[PDB]
Amino acid sequence: LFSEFKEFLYEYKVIPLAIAFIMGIASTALIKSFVDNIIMPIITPFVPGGGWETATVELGPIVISWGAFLGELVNFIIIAFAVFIIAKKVLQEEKVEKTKKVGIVDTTFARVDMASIAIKKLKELSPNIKIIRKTVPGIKDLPVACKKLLEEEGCDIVMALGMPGKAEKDKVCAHEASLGLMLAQLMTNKHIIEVFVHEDEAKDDKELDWLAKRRAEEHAENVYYLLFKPEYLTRMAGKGLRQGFEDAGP
Amino acid sequence: LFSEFKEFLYEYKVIPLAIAFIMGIASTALIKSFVDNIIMPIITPFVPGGGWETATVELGPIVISWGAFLGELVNFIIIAFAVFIIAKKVLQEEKVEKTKKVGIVDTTFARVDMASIAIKKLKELSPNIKIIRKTVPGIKDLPVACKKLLEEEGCDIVMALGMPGKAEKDKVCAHEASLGLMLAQLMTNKHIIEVFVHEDEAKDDKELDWLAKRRAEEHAENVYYLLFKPEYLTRMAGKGLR
Amino acid sequence: LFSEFKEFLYEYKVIPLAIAFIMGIASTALIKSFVDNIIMPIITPFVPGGGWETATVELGPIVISWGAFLGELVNFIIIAFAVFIIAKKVLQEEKVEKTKKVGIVDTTFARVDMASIAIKKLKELSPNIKIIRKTVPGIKDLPVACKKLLEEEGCDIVMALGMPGKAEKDKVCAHEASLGLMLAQLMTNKHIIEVFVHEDEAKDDKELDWLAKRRAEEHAENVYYLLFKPEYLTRMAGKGLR
Amino acid sequence: LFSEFKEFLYEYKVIPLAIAFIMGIASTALIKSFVDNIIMPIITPFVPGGGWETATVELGPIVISWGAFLGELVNFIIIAFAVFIIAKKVLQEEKVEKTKKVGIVDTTFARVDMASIAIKKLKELSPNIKIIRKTVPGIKDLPVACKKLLEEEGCDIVMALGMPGKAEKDKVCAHEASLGLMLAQLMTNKHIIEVFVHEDEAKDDKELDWLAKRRAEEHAENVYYLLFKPEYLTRMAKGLR
Amino acid sequence: LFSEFKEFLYEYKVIPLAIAFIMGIASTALIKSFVDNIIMPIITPFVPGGGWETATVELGPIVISWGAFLGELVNFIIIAFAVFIIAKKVLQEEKVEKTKKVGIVDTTFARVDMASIAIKKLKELSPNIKIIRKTVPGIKDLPVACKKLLEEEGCDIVMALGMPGKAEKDKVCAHEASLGLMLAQLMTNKHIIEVFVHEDEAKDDKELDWLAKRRAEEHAENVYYLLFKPEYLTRMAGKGL
């Protein structure tokens, strides 16, 4: 009996559609009721007993019920400002700027913890940033992970920290992963700064740990830049920067 | 000529659009009809015979039909609460969670049955989980499969169990497959825990069967973690679980 | 003068939006017109000459026009059932006992006609299936082709039969193609059973033709399974049926 | 203060939403006004002076204002046909006709002009086809280009003519390109007949030029087939090459 | 309470939906109120005291309230022109062209600054172009970057300047990047002219710098063409280069 309807509404999301009605209808009435019963009589003391409704002026054999129209004209004017004003405030609820929120996604699988450095270095540059952290097991998980923070968690940018293995089985998963991040960003129109450190890039654990931490730091700086002082980057445009050690120019 | 209209509605999904109308209109009237015919008279015994509608007060040459307005003002107030309240309950029935539902997709093609272990180990960790199982022939099929459970079957997460072959012809299908899973996840914003065991990773049938079952178990634990105690994982962050 | 409007409607697809209105409005009126002019008088013979509209009861100085409210209350009840019931029948859209429809896409480029066997074997397993066939020149064309049948031709599943060449130039086009089929499935949430037979998999024309026809058959069976007895497949789960 | 509203409408595209209202409302009224003031009186000469509105029949102590209901019933009927009929005609813009329109996209980069042959051979097979031609610089450009003609230029099918280079640097661009065409088709549900001729497929300029032209011709034929006599292709369902 | 409702509106963006109502309703009324109270009486001086509402003519035992209908007919006519005209002016706001605006995206990572030349050469060919410039660290960042200027910054076309490294680790990122640009273009139906110069394409810093700048220039010329004189490119079609 009742249920089909309820499930029906859920599936087609009709319910919020209808709430527009009620508001449209109800506010339309409240607005005129006010104008007609209170506003108009105040406006028309010259017409007797609030006869504005039937107020009339004759032009030869022409009879124009101006009062009725005037009542509508002033109604419309009052309804207009309501919509003009209701539209302005929905505009400001949008143009505020809350404090940029960064998302950090890392792995259990990962040997070194880059998240730490990164978050530190980010808080340092701008103590005002909000940081959301989430961790997934494998690199295979960064994409969905990031895309979620970006859409569902209101992050403005995200860092994806990963340690693809040394095996060639690991290399394919790393690329494929990276590529997911690509789509992620494109679907969201937001950046996901990728920071992957292959175990094989460094010869031993001492370097692996040092290297990963330096890069993490370096990228965290970019998150800062892209995010706050983008002018800066253009100044460094085509100036041959790089990740650690030597760089380059002309 | 009736038909064109019906198909028309189907194609443009106009029908549910209209149901909003009816509800908007009909609930608007019922709410006021009640206020006007029953509420107001009760509210206004002082006005004679429910004359509230025409109730009026004069201020010098000014005549303000307050009754009518009061009837609307009280109508509006009753309608507002109707909408405030209707909005609150759609917040609780929507926002509130259910017993997490996991999806498990596997293959006929696959040598070893990893679904088993996995489902067991999952029920163990959290006896309260719902499990949907679907099986397709080839690995080429996991994607659509998973994507379906995720969307059509309300699964919160999915495990795709596969056994790509040893041949290089198998390899390409495995990668391509994996890649679809990537997309699937991104299109759904839900995880699909991939668990592929190449026949060549293990030397013989004894290992192949042992190795597959161990991983299936291990990933099933992750499904648990991501799903229930995600805090845990962060604790394990950059801790080199390899 | 008139045109801008028409193009406007086309671009924003406003027209079907509006048909919701008409229906909402017109059905709202017909429902009440009936209730008020016919239903109510029948309901109220006690009130004289259908005075239910103005029917009233006094409680001290209180005057409650219950007739009007009762007419709305009964109206609302009649409109509700209309919407409860209209919602139920749009739910039964999932009749799907109309007969699963399969799509078969093949190539002119292809040496062997796999379509034939496949169609046969399908009609055999389930004489009740509807078969749509479309053919494109190159393998490059299967994707769009399939995705079309899936969406525009109501097929529930599709088989894409192809014969990628022996050349490495062919190998890249085959991979790229397959991958398209990937997306096609993901975008549609329907399966496309891929069945590609590389000219090089078989040593000669006799084998090529034999091999291709066997596979086409074998996959046609799967179309059957996934489509009708999916419980079978799970039974065969992890049974290395490869 | 008028502005916020205007920008507001633009951002949320509310304006066209509203035009639905007006039409819904205005057509609802015009339809009944006609029925009630003109239709009904004609229908009811037996009732005096168009009293159909108040027309009534008694059944014991029951008083049923059938005139009012009948006027709505006949209104609803006239409104139904209007919506049934308005729905039919919106169904017919999307015919299984229109003179088919083909899109041809080529490159400056490309050494040989395949577009020429292709268009000729297409005009030959069916002088009734409309041909849209757009040319981009690099093969990298065909995708967007094609996806455009398909969507924005109402083309039913598109041919993407290209000549990837001999360098392995060229090879990656060609693959990547092709792959773009893939998506293009899938996003549009329309065919893009790819026709790429690698400079290295042919040994010299004489062959390169000949070979490209032949293929271009050959694919053009397919555009024709896929487009007009699709039955034919199924008959060839026969190792053609 | 009040809040749930507010958050509710935010989440489902119901608020702007409703504004359609108000406008639909309010304008419907203002339009008729005008017609009925002022228009009609002017139209009907022959009927006494604005009796047009009840104006009537008999045909035998037929009574047709033509006045009421005429008032709606003329109402509908006035509402129609309102929607016809309202639809026209949203058309001129919808397809008014200022404008062309190009977007330029480059890298810090990149050795040489191509953006400079490109922007010069574009300003030269058409001093009337607007140029938006944004810079990201790595090549991995061009995609999102470009897709942003295209959608969010109203660019009509975008140039993506990059210098993938010499390492094979760099190669893979470059391809992957390029590929992103693919999608980007397809999703937006706008071009992103890619301009990548691998460090290894040139033997030394003198060449690396020269080569990059020349190409940047050359491509910038294409942005011009595709953008302003596209009939030029077709002329150069299949003319190799």
Side-chain angles (χ1 to χ4, degrees), chain A residues 7 31-32 43 51-52 56 65-66 78-79 86 103 121-122 136 151 156 163 172 176 209 237 248:
Chain A
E7 306 188 323
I31 199 71
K32 86 182 303 288
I43 298 173
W52 63 265
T56 168
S65 338
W66 66 262
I78 299 300
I79 190 63
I86 189 282
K121 184 53 171 297
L122 277 182
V136 291
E151 302 174 86
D156 288 294
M163 293 266 295
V172 172
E176 182 156 8
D209 179 291

PDB file of all heavy atoms in Angstrom, chain A residues 7 31-32 43 51-52 56 65-66 78-79 86 103 121-122 134 136 151 156 163 172 176 209 237 246 248, unseen atoms left out:
ATOM      1  N   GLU A   7       9.444   3.786  -1.312  1.00  0.00           N
ATOM      2  CA  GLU A   7      10.624   3.305  -2.010  1.00  0.00           C
ATOM      3  C   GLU A   7      10.716   4.042  -3.342  1.00  0.00           C
ATOM      4  O   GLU A   7      11.809   4.379  -3.800  1.00  0.00           O
ATOM      5  CB  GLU A   7      10.527   1.803  -2.244  1.00  0.00           C
ATOM      6  CG  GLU A   7      10.262   1.002  -0.972  1.00  0.00           C
ATOM      7  CD  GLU A   7      10.369  -0.486  -1.188  1.00  0.00           C
ATOM      8  OE1 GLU A   7       9.957  -0.942  -2.277  1.00  0.00           O
ATOM      9  OE2 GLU A   7      10.862  -1.183  -0.271  1.00  0.00           O
ATOM     10  N   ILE A  31       3.270  35.870   1.034  1.00  0.00           N
ATOM     11  CA  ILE A  31       3.689  37.168   0.518  1.00  0.00           C
ATOM     12  C   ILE A  31       2.503  38.044   0.066  1.00  0.00           C
ATOM     13  O   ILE A  31       2.466  39.235   0.370  1.00  0.00           O
ATOM     14  CB  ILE A  31       4.731  37.026  -0.635  1.00  0.00           C
ATOM     15  CG1 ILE A  31       5.486  38.353  -0.838  1.00  0.00           C
ATOM     16  CG2 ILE A  31       4.047  36.611  -1.944  1.00  0.00           C
ATOM     17  CD1 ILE A  31       6.453  38.710   0.261  1.00  0.00           C
ATOM     18  N   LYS A  32       1.529  37.467  -0.641  1.00  0.00           N
ATOM     19  CA  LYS A  32       0.384  38.254  -1.117  1.00  0.00           C
ATOM     20  C   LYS A  32      -0.591  38.533   0.009  1.00  0.00           C
ATOM     21  O   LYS A  32      -1.079  39.645   0.148  1.00  0.00           O
ATOM     22  CB  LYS A  32      -0.345  37.556  -2.279  1.00  0.00           C
ATOM     23  CG  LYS A  32      -1.417  36.550  -1.876  1.00  0.00           C
ATOM     24  CD  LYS A  32      -2.069  35.863  -3.063  1.00  0.00           C
ATOM     25  CE  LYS A  32      -2.675  36.855  -4.037  1.00  0.00           C
ATOM     26  NZ  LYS A  32      -3.891  37.466  -3.478  1.00  0.00           N
ATOM     27  N   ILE A  43      -1.558  51.497   2.148  1.00  0.00           N
ATOM     28  CA  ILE A  43      -1.270  52.230   0.926  1.00  0.00           C
ATOM     29  C   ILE A  43      -2.469  53.049   0.466  1.00  0.00           C
ATOM     30  O   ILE A  43      -2.311  54.166  -0.024  1.00  0.00           O
ATOM     31  CB  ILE A  43      -0.910  51.274  -0.222  1.00  0.00           C
ATOM     32  CG1 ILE A  43       0.343  50.489   0.139  1.00  0.00           C
ATOM     33  CG2 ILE A  43      -0.747  52.047  -1.537  1.00  0.00           C
ATOM     34  CD1 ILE A  43       0.658  49.420  -0.864  1.00  0.00           C
ATOM     35  N   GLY A  51     -11.404  49.433  -0.029  1.00  0.00           N
ATOM     36  CA  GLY A  51     -12.092  49.080  -1.255  1.00  0.00           C
ATOM     37  C   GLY A  51     -11.150  49.040  -2.431  1.00  0.00           C
ATOM     38  O   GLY A  51     -11.598  48.865  -3.567  1.00  0.00           O
ATOM     39  N   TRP A  52      -9.853  49.191  -2.166  1.00  0.00           N
ATOM     40  CA  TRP A  52      -8.876  49.190  -3.230  1.00  0.00           C
ATOM     41  C   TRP A  52      -9.105  48.035  -4.187  1.00  0.00           C
ATOM     42  O   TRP A  52      -8.970  48.185  -5.388  1.00  0.00           O
ATOM     43  CB  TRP A  52      -7.463  49.134  -2.657  1.00  0.00           C
ATOM     44  CG  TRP A  52      -7.185  47.909  -1.888  1.00  0.00           C
ATOM     45  CD1 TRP A  52      -7.285  47.736  -0.541  1.00  0.00           C
ATOM     46  CD2 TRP A  52      -6.765  46.661  -2.419  1.00  0.00           C
ATOM     47  NE1 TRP A  52      -6.951  46.448  -0.198  1.00  0.00           N
ATOM     48  CE2 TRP A  52      -6.625  45.768  -1.335  1.00  0.00           C
ATOM     49  CE3 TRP A  52      -6.490  46.206  -3.713  1.00  0.00           C
ATOM     50  CZ2 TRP A  52      -6.225  44.450  -1.498  1.00  0.00           C
ATOM     51  CZ3 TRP A  52      -6.095  44.901  -3.879  1.00  0.00           C
ATOM     52  CH2 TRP A  52      -5.962  44.035  -2.774  1.00  0.00           C
ATOM     53  N   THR A  56     -11.923  51.779  -8.771  1.00  0.00           N
ATOM     54  CA  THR A  56     -12.069  51.908 -10.212  1.00  0.00           C
ATOM     55  C   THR A  56     -12.133  53.331 -10.745  1.00  0.00           C
ATOM     56  O   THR A  56     -12.584  54.250 -10.067  1.00  0.00           O
ATOM     57  CB  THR A  56     -13.313  51.150 -10.701  1.00  0.00           C
ATOM     58  OG1 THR A  56     -13.587  51.508 -12.057  1.00  0.00           O
ATOM     59  CG2 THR A  56     -14.508  51.483  -9.851  1.00  0.00           C
ATOM     60  N   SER A  65     -10.300  48.632 -13.491  1.00  0.00           N
ATOM     61  CA  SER A  65     -10.112  48.231 -12.113  1.00  0.00           C
ATOM     62  C   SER A  65      -8.642  48.338 -11.729  1.00  0.00           C
ATOM     63  O   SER A  65      -7.958  47.331 -11.569  1.00  0.00           O
ATOM     64  CB  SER A  65     -10.597  46.797 -11.948  1.00  0.00           C
ATOM     65  OG  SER A  65     -11.523  46.463 -12.981  1.00  0.00           O
ATOM     66  N   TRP A  66      -8.166  49.562 -11.573  1.00  0.00           N
ATOM     67  CA  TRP A  66      -6.777  49.784 -11.243  1.00  0.00           C
ATOM     68  C   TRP A  66      -6.360  49.291  -9.869  1.00  0.00           C
ATOM     69  O   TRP A  66      -5.239  48.858  -9.658  1.00  0.00           O
ATOM     70  CB  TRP A  66      -6.458  51.250 -11.354  1.00  0.00           C
ATOM     71  CG  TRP A  66      -7.141  52.079 -10.378  1.00  0.00           C
ATOM     72  CD1 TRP A  66      -8.283  52.786 -10.578  1.00  0.00           C
ATOM     73  CD2 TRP A  66      -6.723  52.336  -9.036  1.00  0.00           C
ATOM     74  NE1 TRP A  66      -8.603  53.478  -9.445  1.00  0.00           N
ATOM     75  CE2 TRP A  66      -7.662  53.218  -8.480  1.00  0.00           C
ATOM     76  CE3 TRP A  66      -5.643  51.902  -8.244  1.00  0.00           C
ATOM     77  CZ2 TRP A  66      -7.557  53.680  -7.163  1.00  0.00           C
ATOM     78  CZ3 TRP A  66      -5.534  52.361  -6.937  1.00  0.00           C
ATOM     79  CH2 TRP A  66      -6.492  53.235  -6.406  1.00  0.00           C
ATOM     80  N   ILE A  78       7.088  43.151  -4.263  1.00  0.00           N
ATOM     81  CA  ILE A  78       7.513  42.563  -2.990  1.00  0.00           C
ATOM     82  C   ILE A  78       8.013  41.152  -3.176  1.00  0.00           C
ATOM     83  O   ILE A  78       8.912  40.721  -2.465  1.00  0.00           O
ATOM     84  CB  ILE A  78       6.376  42.565  -1.944  1.00  0.00           C
ATOM     85  CG1 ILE A  78       5.943  43.999  -1.666  1.00  0.00           C
ATOM     86  CG2 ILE A  78       6.807  41.887  -0.652  1.00  0.00           C
ATOM     87  CD1 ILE A  78       7.039  44.880  -1.124  1.00  0.00           C
ATOM     88  N   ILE A  79       7.449  40.421  -4.128  1.00  0.00           N
ATOM     89  CA  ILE A  79       7.901  39.061  -4.342  1.00  0.00           C
ATOM     90  C   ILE A  79       9.249  39.085  -5.032  1.00  0.00           C
ATOM     91  O   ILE A  79      10.111  38.242  -4.774  1.00  0.00           O
ATOM     92  CB  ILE A  79       6.912  38.249  -5.190  1.00  0.00           C
ATOM     93  CG1 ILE A  79       7.315  36.784  -5.174  1.00  0.00           C
ATOM     94  CG2 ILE A  79       6.875  38.758  -6.622  1.00  0.00           C
ATOM     95  CD1 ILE A  79       7.267  36.151  -3.801  1.00  0.00           C
ATOM     96  N   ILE A  86      16.880  36.526  -1.914  1.00  0.00           N
ATOM     97  CA  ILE A  86      17.113  35.149  -1.564  1.00  0.00           C
ATOM     98  C   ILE A  86      18.251  34.628  -2.435  1.00  0.00           C
ATOM     99  O   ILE A  86      19.033  33.786  -2.006  1.00  0.00           O
ATOM    100  CB  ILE A  86      15.830  34.309  -1.745  1.00  0.00           C
ATOM    101  CG1 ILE A  86      16.014  32.896  -1.164  1.00  0.00           C
ATOM    102  CG2 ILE A  86      15.421  34.293  -3.202  1.00  0.00           C
ATOM    103  CD1 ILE A  86      16.809  31.938  -2.025  1.00  0.00           C
ATOM    104  N   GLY A 103      44.116  16.844   1.801  1.00  0.00           N
ATOM    105  CA  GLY A 103      43.902  15.449   2.124  1.00  0.00           C
ATOM    106  C   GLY A 103      45.194  14.675   1.961  1.00  0.00           C
ATOM    107  O   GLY A 103      45.942  14.885   0.988  1.00  0.00           O
ATOM    108  N   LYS A 121      55.581  19.609   7.732  1.00  0.00           N
ATOM    109  CA  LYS A 121      55.961  20.657   6.811  1.00  0.00           C
ATOM    110  C   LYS A 121      54.795  21.495   6.273  1.00  0.00           C
ATOM    111  O   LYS A 121      54.983  22.647   5.908  1.00  0.00           O
ATOM    112  CB  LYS A 121      56.732  20.049   5.653  1.00  0.00           C
ATOM    113  CG  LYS A 121      57.269  21.071   4.682  1.00  0.00           C
ATOM    114  CD  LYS A 121      58.088  22.119   5.430  1.00  0.00           C
ATOM    115  CE  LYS A 121      58.829  23.035   4.474  1.00  0.00           C
ATOM    116  NZ  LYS A 121      59.820  22.265   3.666  1.00  0.00           N
ATOM    117  N   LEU A 122      53.602  20.918   6.201  1.00  0.00           N
ATOM    118  CA  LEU A 122      52.452  21.671   5.708  1.00  0.00           C
ATOM    119  C   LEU A 122      51.941  22.570   6.811  1.00  0.00           C
ATOM    120  O   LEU A 122      51.615  23.735   6.573  1.00  0.00           O
ATOM    121  CB  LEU A 122      51.308  20.748   5.262  1.00  0.00           C
ATOM    122  CG  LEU A 122      51.303  20.109   3.881  1.00  0.00           C
ATOM    123  CD1 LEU A 122      50.022  19.293   3.744  1.00  0.00           C
ATOM    124  CD2 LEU A 122      51.389  21.171   2.802  1.00  0.00           C
ATOM    125  N   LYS A 134      43.846   9.657   5.801  1.00  0.00           N
ATOM    126  CA  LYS A 134      43.150   8.380   5.670  1.00  0.00           C
ATOM    127  C   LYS A 134      44.218   7.488   5.139  1.00  0.00           C
ATOM    128  O   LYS A 134      45.123   7.921   4.405  1.00  0.00           O
ATOM    129  CB  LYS A 134      41.954   8.440   4.681  1.00  0.00           C
ATOM    130  CG  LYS A 134      41.126   7.155   4.574  1.00  0.00           C
ATOM    131  N   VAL A 136      45.085   3.570   3.392  1.00  0.00           N
ATOM    132  CA  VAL A 136      44.616   2.352   2.812  1.00  0.00           C
ATOM    133  C   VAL A 136      45.784   1.406   2.833  1.00  0.00           C
ATOM    134  O   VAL A 136      46.950   1.823   3.016  1.00  0.00           O
ATOM    135  CB  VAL A 136      44.150   2.567   1.363  1.00  0.00           C
ATOM    136  CG1 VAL A 136      42.859   3.405   1.351  1.00  0.00           C
ATOM    137  CG2 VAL A 136      45.284   3.199   0.540  1.00  0.00           C
ATOM    138  N   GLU A 151      35.928  14.716  -3.266  1.00  0.00           N
ATOM    139  CA  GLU A 151      34.474  14.935  -3.407  1.00  0.00           C
ATOM    140  C   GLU A 151      33.711  14.880  -2.087  1.00  0.00           C
ATOM    141  O   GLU A 151      33.088  15.855  -1.684  1.00  0.00           O
ATOM    142  CB  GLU A 151      33.852  13.937  -4.385  1.00  0.00           C
ATOM    143  CG  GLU A 151      34.460  13.975  -5.776  1.00  0.00           C
ATOM    144  CD  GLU A 151      33.939  12.891  -6.696  1.00  0.00           C
ATOM    145  OE1 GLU A 151      32.884  13.135  -7.320  1.00  0.00           O
ATOM    146  OE2 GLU A 151      34.582  11.802  -6.780  1.00  0.00           O
ATOM    147  N   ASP A 156      40.664  20.383  -0.876  1.00  0.00           N
ATOM    148  CA  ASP A 156      40.974  21.226  -2.024  1.00  0.00           C
ATOM    149  C   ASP A 156      42.080  20.639  -2.837  1.00  0.00           C
ATOM    150  O   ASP A 156      42.196  20.912  -4.017  1.00  0.00           O
ATOM    151  CB  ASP A 156      41.342  22.615  -1.569  1.00  0.00           C
ATOM    152  CG  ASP A 156      40.151  23.359  -1.073  1.00  0.00           C
ATOM    153  OD1 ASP A 156      39.262  23.649  -1.890  1.00  0.00           O
ATOM    154  OD2 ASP A 156      40.108  23.657   0.140  1.00  0.00           O
ATOM    155  N   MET A 163      54.738   3.784  -1.833  1.00  0.00           N
ATOM    156  CA  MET A 163      56.032   3.086  -1.920  1.00  0.00           C
ATOM    157  C   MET A 163      55.906   1.840  -2.791  1.00  0.00           C
ATOM    158  O   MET A 163      55.857   0.716  -2.268  1.00  0.00           O
ATOM    159  CB  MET A 163      56.499   2.654  -0.530  1.00  0.00           C
ATOM    160  CG  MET A 163      56.858   3.797   0.375  1.00  0.00           C
ATOM    161  SD  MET A 163      58.627   4.064   0.240  1.00  0.00           S
ATOM    162  CE  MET A 163      59.254   2.545   0.922  1.00  0.00           C
ATOM    163  N   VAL A 172      53.995  -2.473 -12.338  1.00  0.00           N
ATOM    164  CA  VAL A 172      52.741  -2.380 -13.099  1.00  0.00           C
ATOM    165  C   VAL A 172      51.621  -1.829 -12.248  1.00  0.00           C
ATOM    166  O   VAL A 172      50.790  -1.064 -12.726  1.00  0.00           O
ATOM    167  CB  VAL A 172      52.288  -3.734 -13.660  1.00  0.00           C
ATOM    168  CG1 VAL A 172      50.899  -3.624 -14.275  1.00  0.00           C
ATOM    169  CG2 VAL A 172      53.269  -4.193 -14.712  1.00  0.00           C
ATOM    170  N   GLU A 176      49.611   1.742 -13.070  1.00  0.00           N
ATOM    171  CA  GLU A 176      48.169   1.620 -13.069  1.00  0.00           C
ATOM    172  C   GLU A 176      47.550   2.468 -11.998  1.00  0.00           C
ATOM    173  O   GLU A 176      46.483   3.038 -12.177  1.00  0.00           O
ATOM    174  CB  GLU A 176      47.804   0.169 -12.820  1.00  0.00           C
ATOM    175  CG  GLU A 176      46.327  -0.130 -12.837  1.00  0.00           C
ATOM    176  CD  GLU A 176      46.089  -1.593 -13.170  1.00  0.00           C
ATOM    177  OE1 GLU A 176      47.079  -2.364 -13.222  1.00  0.00           O
ATOM    178  OE2 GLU A 176      44.925  -1.978 -13.335  1.00  0.00           O
ATOM    179  N   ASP A 209      64.807   5.471   3.697  1.00  0.00           N
ATOM    180  CA  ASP A 209      64.133   6.314   4.667  1.00  0.00           C
ATOM    181  C   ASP A 209      64.474   7.798   4.519  1.00  0.00           C
ATOM    182  O   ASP A 209      63.611   8.655   4.678  1.00  0.00           O
ATOM    183  CB  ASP A 209      64.427   5.863   6.103  1.00  0.00           C
ATOM    184  CG  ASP A 209      63.743   6.750   7.144  1.00  0.00           C
ATOM    185  OD1 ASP A 209      64.139   7.939   7.286  1.00  0.00           O
ATOM    186  OD2 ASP A 209      62.801   6.266   7.815  1.00  0.00           O
ATOM    187  N   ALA A 237      58.675  29.456 -13.308  1.00  0.00           N
ATOM    188  CA  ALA A 237      58.354  28.779 -14.551  1.00  0.00           C
ATOM    189  C   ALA A 237      59.537  28.616 -15.457  1.00  0.00           C
ATOM    190  O   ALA A 237      60.260  29.557 -15.725  1.00  0.00           O
ATOM    191  CB  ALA A 237      57.269  29.522 -15.283  1.00  0.00           C
ATOM    192  N   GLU A 246      70.951  18.657  -7.380  1.00  0.00           N
ATOM    193  CA  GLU A 246      71.002  19.628  -8.469  1.00  0.00           C
ATOM    194  C   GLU A 246      69.656  19.865  -9.245  1.00  0.00           C
ATOM    195  O   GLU A 246      68.740  19.042  -9.191  1.00  0.00           O
ATOM    196  CB  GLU A 246      72.167  19.255  -9.406  1.00  0.00           C
ATOM    197  N   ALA A 248      68.615  22.991 -12.628  1.00  0.00           N
ATOM    198  CA  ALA A 248      68.919  23.480 -14.007  1.00  0.00           C
ATOM    199  C   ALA A 248      68.223  24.796 -14.496  1.00  0.00           C
ATOM    200  O   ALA A 248      67.228  25.248 -13.968  1.00  0.00           O
ATOM    201  CB  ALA A 248      68.699  22.382 -15.011  1.00  0.00           C
TER     202      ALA A 248
END
